[PDB]
From a paper:
[name] is a 161-amino acid protein with molecular weight of 17.4 kDa that belongs to an uncharacterized subgroup of macrodomain proteins. Macrodomains are ancient folds with high affinity for ADP-ribose binding. Here we determine the structure of [name] and show that this protein hydrolyzes glutamate-linked protein mono-ADP-ribosylation. Furthermore, we show that depletion of [name] leads to a significantly increased production of antibiotic actinorhodin in [name].
Residue numbers in the entry: 3 to 89, 96 to 125, 128 to 158
The structure:
Amino acid sequence: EISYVRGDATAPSVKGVKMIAHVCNDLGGWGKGFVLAVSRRWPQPEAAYRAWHRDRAANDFGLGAVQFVQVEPYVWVANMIGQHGMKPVRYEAIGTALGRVADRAAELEASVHLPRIGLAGGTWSRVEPLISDRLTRRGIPVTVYDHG
Ligand code: NA
Ligand code: NA
């Protein structure tokens, strides 16, 4: 059962392996919103993402791909390529990425921690059902965080 909490998703307070999953764009932009909250806590995810994008001519970077970045002994950030362009979230891309998060979280026995991007609007009304279908359906604990 998805938990809804007000908090900073970069600091989950639960036991066991934690995975913080969030939506990135496919253009290499890391400059507004939750990506800044991540860089306020750890430098690794941003460095990883920029390198991943820079080297896309030799690697898996693209819509629906996910990069897992270890930031603490039992904490990982999952940079999901889910958004096409910048100021537009792609349903197939987010679905695929969340499934990949689910695969990795299942093997790590991790819980998953996501910032909220409500169910009455275009974005979250696509995303939350894919959380249910790709994560909850597999028995993976999920917590969704509200913060500015
Ligand atoms: Na919430
Ligand atoms: Na709230």
